[PDB]
Amino acid sequence: DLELKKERRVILDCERDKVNDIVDQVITIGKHVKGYHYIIANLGFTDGD
Amino acid sequence: DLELKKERRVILDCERDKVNDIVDQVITIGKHVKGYHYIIANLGFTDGD
Ligand SMILES: *[C@@H]1O[C@H](CO)[C@@H](O[C@@H]2O[C@H](CO)[C@@H](O)[C@H](O)[C@H]2NC(C)=O)[C@H](O)[C@H]1NC(C)=O
């Protein structure tokens, strides 16, 4: 449904466990190539993988 | 080096241990979006992940 508006840009605001799950599902569906953008809205940006 | 001639279609002739490593590295570098074609050149096609 995010591809309906052709969203090239998503800001993620989740906890230290949900960020890893969303990034793993994005990697599974393949939406991390050059052409998109992401912002991990937390203080521990290096805490995730 | 495979992006020099803009190679789109790659045949993987590897055993059941190296195919999973090549697929994991493709997913890590992000080259499994729509536009590329791959052939798992073996007999146990459903053996890999
Ligand atoms: C990566 O971040 C930049 C912002 O620093 C995004 O915008 C680019 O900004 C540079 C300026 O340093 C321009 O020269 C580029 O033309 C801009 N990109 C575009 C597409 O216009 C850039 O979009 C980001 N990358 C992605 C894939 O979103």
Curated annotation (Swiss-Prot), chains A, B:
Entry comment describing in which tissues the protein is expressed: Detected in forebrain. Detected in dendrites of neuronal cells. Expressed in the pyramidal cell layers of CA1 and CA3 and in the granule cell layer of the dentate gyrus.
Subcellular location as annotated: Cell membrane; Postsynaptic cell membrane; Postsynaptic density membrane
Induction: Down-regulated in the pyramidal cell layer of CA1 in the hippocampus by global ischemia.
Posttranslational mods: Palmitoylated. Depalmitoylated upon L-glutamate stimulation. Ubiquitinated by RNF167, leading to its degradation.
Subunit structure: Homotetramer or heterotetramer of pore-forming glutamate receptor subunits. Tetramers may be formed by the dimerization of dimers. May interact with MPP4. Forms a ternary complex with GRIP1 and CSPG4. Interacts with ATAD1 in an ATP-dependent manner. ATAD1-catalyzed ATP hydrolysis disrupts binding to ATAD1 and to GRIP1 and leads to AMPAR complex disassembly. Interacts with GRIP2. Interacts with GRIP1. Interacts with NSF via its C-terminus. Interacts with CACNG2, PICK1 and GRIP2. Interacts with GRIA1 and SYNDIG1. Part of a complex containing GRIA2, NSF and NAPA and/or NAPB.
Misc. comment: The postsynaptic actions of L-glutamate are mediated by a variety of receptors that are named according to their selective agonists. This receptor binds AMPA (quisqualate) > L-glutamate > kainate.
Function text: Ionotropic glutamate receptor that functions as a ligand-gated cation channel, gated by L-glutamate and glutamatergic agonists such as alpha-amino-3-hydroxy-5-methyl-4-isoxazolepropionic acid (AMPA), quisqualic acid, and kainic acid. L-glutamate acts as an excitatory neurotransmitter at many synapses in the central nervous system and plays an important role in fast excitatory synaptic transmission.
Written domain comment of the UniProt record: The M4 transmembrane segment mediates tetramerization and is required for cell surface expression.
Record family assignment: Belongs to the glutamate-gated ion channel (TC 1.A.10.1) family. GRIA2 subfamily.
Name this protein carries in UniProt: Glutamate receptor 2
Organism: Rattus norvegicus (Rat)
Name of the gene encoding the protein in the UniProt record: Gria2
